[PDB]
Amino acid sequence: MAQDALSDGFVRLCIDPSLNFFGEGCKILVEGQITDDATAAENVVTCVNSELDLVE
C-alpha cells in the first residue's frame, strides 16, 4: 500500500546519501606514531572513514 505511486510494486525506491556509484579510487597508506590513549591495534592496516573517527 503506502503512497499511491509506489503501491503496485513496479518500482522499488531507496533513498540514502551514503551510497556512491563510482568504484573506490586509488589507495593511499599513511604511517606514523600514536599515543597510549589510541584504541587502534599496533602494526595493523585499517580503513578510515572520516576526520571525526580520529582522536579516539
Binding site: 503506502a2 509506489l6 510494486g9 525506491l13 531507496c14 533513498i15
Partner: protein, 56 residues
C-alpha cells in the same frame, strides 16, 4: 508532549516509514524541547526525521 522517551519512539516510527524494506509513507514530525542551554543541547540525537523547537 515533552517526554524524551515518547519523542524517541516517534522518531523510530518515522524512520520505518522512510525505510527501504517496503513501500514508503513519507512524513515529518514536530517536537519541542525546553530548558537551559546546557539541557537543550543534550537532546540533539541527530534525527533527520524531526524538527526540534528550542524554548527558554
Amino acid at each position: 508532549s515533552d517526554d524524551t522517551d515518547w519523542q524517541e519512539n516517534l522518531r523510530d516510527w518515522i524512520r520505518s516509514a522512510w525505510d527501504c524494506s517496503k513501500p514508503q509513507c513519507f512524513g515529518h514530525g514536530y517536537v519541542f524541547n525546553k530548558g537551559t542551554l546546557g539541557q537543550v543541547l543534550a537532546d540533539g540525537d541527530n534525527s533527520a526525521e524531526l524538527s526540534r523547537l528550542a524554548l527558554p
